[PDB]
Every structure is written in structure tokens, then in C-alpha cells.
Design a protein around this nucleic acid. Structure first.
Ligand SMILES: [Zn+2]
Lengths: 121, 208, 50, 205, 156
RNA sequence: CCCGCAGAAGAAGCACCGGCUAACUCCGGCCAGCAGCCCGGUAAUACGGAGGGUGCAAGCGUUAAUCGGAAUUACUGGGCGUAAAGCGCACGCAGGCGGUUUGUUAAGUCAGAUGUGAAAUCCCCGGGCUCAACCUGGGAACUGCAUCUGAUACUGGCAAG
RNA sequence: AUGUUUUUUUUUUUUUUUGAUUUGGUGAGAGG
């Protein structure tokens, strides 16, 4: 605080670590599904949340949420993950409508966010 | 169900009865039934007319009805056209000669039942219940009520969890028997459910 | 009529502190004259002296 | 790059008459100008602090027919320039070629004026200018070219204008169909209902 | 002539034998678009009543503020409890650059042009108070001259 | 770049609408799903569809990343009795700071000048591409460094008190 | 002798004040 003190030893900047380190400063990363499964969320919620453990291109083994209703993913399915954490230990989302992950069926609103092409009529 | 009915506790002292006749155990039940019928009919008919109190009084095998209403003009219609019509039906209901009298209610804001009815109507036509209640209270006060209370209950503003709210103004002594407490009730059959409206109007204390 | 015998710009607004056609419906800017109204903005008795 | 939808809807939303239709027929007859658009029009709860500002911004933008990025740019320019920011912005808006044309009375609406500008009808100092955003300067004569001078719409527009109040900052000739942008307008010359300050605040978040 | 802005309304509770009794606090502020400002803090079982009370409070115990044209006379700090507030006079056109409760008070006061940051707490009630204090303390050139035994041209 | 030809012709989507946050209704059971932080168990403005609206617009969302907000490392600009924070207490080298008067010096300090501080970029006034972006003339700026000439209140050095 | 031992959203917006109750010539007839 004291100017002399500051001079002696300056002020330390708070180094904030990244909450999506398996990306390694990439907007998305390609990965292969090591396994796909459902998981129960913590309190107070209740569901069977669809999630896949993904071995990434850069070597990391992470677990990625699968948004939307329904998915085609199996083991050995090449998917793109984007970062974003579902509110234990899931810090990433599968990009629907990229690589092997399909767009959500019968969806008409927020279509972009689930890979869905524009409905023709 | 805490409270005693304010009319009912005072029938011997400051409040009078509505049905005012004598009958032996033989004919009493029948008479009561008749009264119920006629009253029901009247309510059905004179809904649009602001009617407070039907007073039935049967001497000598002939029924005398007395309708207390705020606007006689709509109950009477053209001079002795609607009243007459009412009479024959009343007679039919009873099975005796009928006679309808129509008392004109001075100050319908001070009559409790009428106020309640008004409130119910308001509720039905989708006003803010609270604003209606306020209006009811205020108006009575303006008119010269020593006090008024109103209470409304259940599904207020179509809310899932029902509750009761009530506005008092002035003094409304219920434990005091000699207090002229005009009490009455009504029910708003809204889209979300029933909303019950109670209203107490304290005219003043009687000294005897 | 704009602008005839009973004009707006030449004399004044019929209503008090109102553009007859449409602007100023409170008490803040008494005087502004838009092109859509071609109207002054004063009292109801202002036309009696003009 | 333009708003192509219902014009009166916008006006309704705003509350005021934005002058998005010529003014032959009064706005109250064409639409429920008091009632807001859509299913939930009759309901009107008091707006937020942010919201009012936003609305104000929209109004101004709507009036001139300027999309958001452009508007932002204009605001920035105003800020950069010396003097009062809101006023400057207003001046800039006015300065637009299409707006100027509208003022003159060669377009019934601002939209019409813009269209005319686009279609190589208008000249500024005897040189065909096609850009609606073109900032017209002081002493810059602006006219209809001889090809577009025969159009019935132009005369109608002029007539409409003649009914409408004449701006002091211009000087227009109906026969010659050429107007001189004499000077950039003062704030007093413009409409008082526009709260420029709100707009300024909105961008000063 | 007076303009009045309800800044915030907050529901506050009192626990009793039965359960929770709820009530409403209304923070308002009123001003004449010139020096005079006054905030009022009213409380009642229903909102509108509370608001009314607040307004009433505001209308009495107003305070005068020396305003050089649309803006303040010099940069002024004002503190109250957690909320410490800085506000700085600004050129015509800039508008009220200030956040929340602070803005409202300024607007009624009839300052049109300010640059104002609220450091510390931003608890509306405290911050408005702080703002008021700042306004109050702020002296004019004439006043300063009077204080110092000089003319206005000596001070500039 | 200009002129002529035809005919509204070939040309609008994306996100969002519980609060923060601009925008609301109806129809489908802690499931399916949403989520940036703080819904869903049968009347969900929070899930999905619709109608309606709001915001952006040839883009619109999402992700990643940086500053901002964050006075949340606080030089400007924070704190430490109870919220995190006074060494258990002292002595004391280096270091930091230093009562008062005069003289002197002129290191710090201040003033002016000179040299330099590449051009571009930023900013001001202009000019040129129909406008704009873009290009561009001149200025200002580049908060500095060096040197020379002064000023000597303050800080420092030296000398006496 | 002893208690973090059955938690689940059973959810935060007023009225506002600011303004008024509205009827011109012509001709005919009566009272004093
Ligand atoms: Zn007007």
C-alpha cells in the first residue's frame, strides 16, 4: 500500500485460469466419443442428462454435454465440442449439426443452435 | 370457523326476522319450503334489479311479500305491470293469494348485501378486486356509516394459491349486541373459481 | 381550414395549449410549431384578441 | 438494409405520428395510432429507464429510416464534432440527401424521397448523386434532373409539402424544382418532441 | 410544476408468532427542475400507500442546490454509509451520465449534464442520500466570494 | 463512368420475448428438456410447437480470446478492533523519511532554446474517389532522451550556526 | 446423554392530477 512498499514489491495481477482448458484457446475442437451415457444431475434438479466422454484431438479426455432432444451419437463417433459448462465436471457441449453429430429432429425455433436446416414449404 | 353470524346473534334485540309468521308443527316445514321457493324465484328474477331483503309475512291463508330494493322503477317497470306479473307467480309458488309490496332502499351504499352484490359483479367483469373493495369501503364511509368492513377470499387475481384480504374503516363492533351491524355475503363465480365476499356495515348503536 | 378564414397559424389553436392536429399534450413546450400542424400554442381566449 | 414492412405499425409502437405516410389521409383513420401493435396492444405498463431511451432512439431512427450501425456511426461523428452532441447528431440526420429532398417536397414520404435518390432523379450541384446517406452541405443546390421532372409523383409531393409547414433552413422553387440547402438547421427549427439527450445517454452506457 | 420519480420499491418482512408479515418500502425523490430536491422513504403494507407516503415525505424537507446553468459548479464527492459518489460537471449536450438511483435524483434536480460514478455500495437509499449530500455541499462562485471577502472576478 | 431496353420484375434472414433485458399469449407432466447467473411434479409468459411481438439485418447467433464493468492488486484509486488483514515483544545494519537560521552550490525541480523523437497509424483543419469506408496535403501530437542558457521557493549536497 | 435428522420455490408494482360540465340572429304574441 505504502508507495515505498509498492516500489519494493509491486502489485500482483490476479491470474484467472480458463474454465475450458481442453480447448486450449480454440473455439471448437474435434473429438471421438469414447463412451455415451446418461447422468443424474445434482440437487435440486431431476433428469437423465445425455452426455459423452470424448477423447479430443489434442489428447485430453473430457466429458461433453449433448443438447437438444435426442441424438444419434454412438462410440467412435467424430464430434465437435464448443465449450460451455452445464451447471459435476461437464465443461463442454457437442455442437449439434457438425461432423457426425446430427441436428435435432422436428425443431423450428432456435434452429441454428441445434444444427437444423430451414424448413421448406 | 371462528365467528358467530352477526345477523343471527342479534335477531332477538336489534335485528328483526325476514320470514314473519306463526304456524303449528304441522304446517311449519311446508311454509319454510314455500318461503325458500319464492325467495329463490325472486332472486332469479330481480338479479339486475338491486334487491337487498325479501321479507315474507303470511296472515290468514294469504302471503304478503315485501321486496326491499334500491331501484323500484326496474322491479315495478310500468306502473303495476311487472309487480302484478310477479304476484301471480308468487301465488302459484305458494298456493295462496299473493300480495307484493316494494320498499325503496335509501342509500344502497350503506346496505351491506347490495354492496356485496356490487363487488361480486365487479369481480365477475374482471376488475382489480382490491380497487373494488376500496370503492366499497370509501363509498359507505362517505354516506355516513359509523364503520364498514369488507372481506374477499379465494383465487384473487386468478392466483393458484388462494388467499383472503379485507379492508376495514371506522369501527365495526361485533361482540357488542346492541350495535346495528348489517352483515351480508355474496359469491363471484369467476373463471378461476368462486370468490366469496363478506361485508359488515355498522350503522350505529341502538339505545333502549 | 388551413389556411382559410378560421386558420391555425394566422390565429391560434382551438384547444388550450394543444396543437389541434397532434403534438404537446402536457405543459412543457408552449410555443413550438411543427410543419405538420402550422399551428401556434397558447390559451382558448387568445384568438379573441388576435 | 431497409425496413420493408408495415410503416404504421412502427408509429403505433412509438406512440407518435412518425410521418411514414404521405399525409393525404390522417393517421387516426388509417390505424389505431394510440393502441400498440400485436395481440397485446391495449395493455400498456410503464416502461423502464433503459427501455424509454431505447424507444426514443428507435423513434428517431424510424423517422429518418436509418439502420443501427449507420446510426451508431452518426452518433460517433457527432460526439467527435464540437458543440452539443445530440444537436450535432440531429443536424447530421437532417443533412442526409433523402431527408433534404423530403423537406423540399419532392417526395411525399421520406421513403419516397430515398427511392427517388436511388433511381438517379436528384442532382446536387448539377451532378447526379445516388446515395441517400449523402450529407448535403450549406449552399449546395439540389434539384430534380430533366428526365424525372415530368413525374406526377413529384408534383403531388410538392403539393403535399405546400400544405405542410416550410422549413426555414431551406429555400425551394416549385416551378424550377431546385432547392438550396442554405444552412445546417438549428435545434429550434426541428421538432421539440425528440429527446436527443436520451439517445445520447443510451450510447453513453 | 414538481416532478417526482419513484426510484425503488422493496418488499421487507417482519417475522411474528404466526409467520411473516410483509410490507413495502418506497424510495422516491422530487424536484422542481431547479436547485430544489428532496428524497422521501415511505413504508406501508401495500405498495401504492407506501409510495404516497414516500412522496409526502419528499415534498417536505427539500434542499436547494446551486446550479451553474444545466450542470454542476465543480467536481464534487458525496458519501453516505457504503455509497460514496463522485460527480463532475460536464459540457452541454453530454446528458446525465450516471447510474440508477443517482440518475433519478439528478434528473429531478434539473441537472442536465453530468459525469457521475457511484463507487462503493449502490444501495439505492444510501446512494441517493450520498448524491443529495454532494449536491448540498457544492458551493457556487458567488457564495465562495462572499465567504472569502472578494469579488467574483477576483476568483474567476 | 455514361446512355438505352424491358418489367415489381431476380433479391430476408438470424437471435430473442421469467428477472437482469427491449419484447406475451394459447396448445402440448422433476419427464422430455432449458440455463450466462438467479424453471419443469397436469392451469409452465423459463421446456417443445404455434400465433403475436422485440432487437439486429445480408447478415444473425453460438464458442474462443482480450480490455471493460472490477475502486475485485486501488499510481490516479481500497483496506487491516468484530468482515481477509498489525510480526508475541524488542534492539538494530542496509533502506526510507528528517526541527530551525544564514550563506553557497545548482544535482532534483521549473523556464526557454537547440538537436533528436523514421514514415505510416491516432487526433485537428482541408482536398480526392457520386457518399462512405478508402486515399490523401498541411498541422498537432509522439507526454521522452540529450545538450546549452537562465530561475533558486521547495528537496538534495557542502560550510557555518 | 444427544441433535443443521426430511429439505423443494407454497416466488418482489402504484394509480398519476391536469385542466370542465357545455346553447347564436329573424319574426309573432302576452304581463307590467
Ligand atoms: Zn403541433
Amino acid at each position: 500500500a505504502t508507495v515505498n512498499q509498492l516500489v519494493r514489491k509491486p502489485r500482483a495481477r490476479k491470474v484467472a485460469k480458463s474454465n475450458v482448458p481442453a480447448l486450449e484457446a480454440c473455439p471448437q475442437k474435434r473429438g471421438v466419443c469414447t463412451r455415451v451415457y446418461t447422468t443424474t444431475p445434482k440437487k435440486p434438479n431431476s433428469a437423465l442428462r445425455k452426455v459423452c466422454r470424448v477423447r479430443l484431438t489434442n489428447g485430453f479426455e473430457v466429458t461433453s454435454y449433448i443438447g437438444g432432444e435426442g441424438h444419434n451419437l454412438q462410440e467412435h463417433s467424430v464430434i465437435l465440442i464448443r465449450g460451455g459448462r452445464v451447471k459435476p465436471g461437464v465443461r463442454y457441449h457437442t455442437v449439434r449439426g457438425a461432423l457426425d453429430c446430427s441436428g435435432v429432429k422436428d425443431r423450428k425455433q432456435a434452429r441454428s443452435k441445434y444444427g437444423v436446416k430451414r424448413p421448406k414449404a | 370457523g371462528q365467528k358467530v353470524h352477526p345477523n343471527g346473534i342479534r335477531l332477538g334485540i336489534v335485528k328483526p326476522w325476514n320470514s314473519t309468521w306463526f304456524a303449528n308443527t304441522k304446517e311449519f316445514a311446508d311454509n319454510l319450503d314455500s318461503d325458500f321457493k319464492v325467495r329463490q324465484y325472486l332472486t332469479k328474477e330481480l338479479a339486475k334489479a338491486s334487491v337487498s331483503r325479501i321479507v315474507i309475512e303470511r296472515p290468514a291463508k294469504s302471503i304478503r311479500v315485501t321486496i326491499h330494493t334500491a331501484r323500484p322503477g326496474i322491479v315495478i317497470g310500468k306502473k303495476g305491470e311487472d309487480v302484478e306479473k310477479l304476484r301471480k307467480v308468487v301465488a302459484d309458488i305458494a298456493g295462496v293469494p299473493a300480495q307484493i309490496n316494494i320498499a325503496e332502499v335509501r342509500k344502497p351504499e350503506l346496505d351491506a348485501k347490495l354492496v356485496a352484490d356490487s363487488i361480486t359483479s365487479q369481480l365477475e367483469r374482471r376488475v382489480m378486486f382490491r380497487r373494488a373493495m376500496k370503492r366499497a369501503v370509501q363509498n359507505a364511509m362517505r354516506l355516513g356509516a359509523k364503520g364498514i368492513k369488507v372481506e374477499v377470499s379465494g383465487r384473487l387475481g386468478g392466483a393458484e394459491i388462494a388467499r383472503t384480504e379485507w379492508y376495514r374503516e371506522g369501527r365495526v363492533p361485533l361482540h357488542t349486541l346492541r350495535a346495528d351491524i348489517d352483515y351480508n355475503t355474496s359469491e363471484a363465480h369467476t373463471t378461476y373459481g368462486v370468490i366469496g365476499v363478506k361485508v359488515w356495515i355498522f350503522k350505529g348503536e341502538i339505545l333502549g | 381550414e388551413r389556411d382559410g378564414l378560421f386558420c391555425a397559424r394566422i390565429f391560434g389553436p382551438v384547444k388550450d395549449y394543444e396543437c389541434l392536429c397532434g403534438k404537446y399534450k402536457r405543459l412543457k413546450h408552449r410555443g413550438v410549431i411543427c410543419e405538420k400542424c402550422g399551428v401556434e400554442v397558447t390559451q382558448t381566449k387568445v384568438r379573441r384578441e388576435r | 438494409a431497409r425496413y420493408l414492412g408495415p410503416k404504421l405499425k412502427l408509429s403505433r409502437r412509438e406512440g407518435t405520428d412518425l410521418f411514414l405516410k404521405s399525409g393525404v389521409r390522417a393517421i387516426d383513420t388509417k390505424c389505431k395510432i394510440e393502441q400498440a401493435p400485436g395481440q397485446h396492444g391495449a395493455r400498456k405498463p410503464r416502461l423502464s429507464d433503459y427501455g424509454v431511451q431505447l424507444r426514443e432512439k428507435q423513434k428517431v431512427r424510424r423517422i429518418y429510416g436509418v439502420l443501427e450501425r449507420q446510426f451508431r456511426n452518426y452518433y460517433k461523428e457527432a460526439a467527435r464534432l464540437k458543440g452539443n452532441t445530440g444537436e450535432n447528431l440531429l443536424a447530421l440526420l437532417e443533412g442526409r440527401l433523402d431527408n433534404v429532398v423530403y423537406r423540399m417536397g419532392f417526395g411525399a414520404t421520406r421513403a419516397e424521397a430515398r427511392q427517388l435518390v436511388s433511381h438517379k432523379a436528384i442532382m446536387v450541384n448539377g451532378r447526379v448523386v445516388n446515395i441517400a446517406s449523402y450529407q448535403v452541405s450549406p449552399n449546395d443546390v439540389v434539384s430534380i434532373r430533366e428526365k424525372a421532372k415530368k413525374q406526377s409523383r413529384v408534383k403531388a409531393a410538392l403539393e403535399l409539402a405546400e400544405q405542410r409547414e416550410k422549413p426555414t433552413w431551406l429555400e425551394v422553387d416549385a416551378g424550377k424544382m431546385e432547392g438550396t440547402f442554405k444552412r445546417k438547421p438549428e435545434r429550434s427549427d426541428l421538432s421539440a418532441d425528440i429527446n436527443e439527450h436520451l439517445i445520447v445517454e443510451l450510447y453513453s452506457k | 410544476e414538481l416532478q417526482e420519480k419513484l426510484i425503488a420499491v422493496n418488499r421487507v418482512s417482519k417475522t411474528v408468532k404466526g409467520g411473516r408479515i410483509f410490507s413495502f418500502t418506497a424510495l422516491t425523490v422530487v424536484g422542481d427542475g431547479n436547485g430544489r430536491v428532496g428524497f422521501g422513504y415511505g413504508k406501508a403494507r401495500e405498495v401504492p400507500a407506501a409510495i404516497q407516503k414516500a412522496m409526502e415525505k419528499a415534498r417536505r424537507n427539500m434542499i436547494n442546490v446551486a446550479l451553474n446553468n444545466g450542470t454542476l459548479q465543480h467536481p464534487v464527492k458525496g458519501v453516505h454509509t457504503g455509497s460514496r459518489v463522485f460527480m463532475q460537471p460536464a459540457s452541454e449536450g453530454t446528458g446525465i451520465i450516471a447510474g440508477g438511483a443517482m440518475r433519478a435524483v439528478l434528473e429531478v434536480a434539473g441537472v442536465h449534464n453530468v459525469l457521475a460514478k457511484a463507487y462503493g455500495s449502490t444501495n439505492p437509499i444510501n446512494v441517493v442520500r450520498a448524491t443529495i449530500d454532494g449536491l448540498e455541499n457544492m458551493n457556487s462562485p458567488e457564495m465562495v466570494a462572499a465567504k472569502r471577502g472578494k469579488s467574483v472576478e477576483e476568483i474567476l
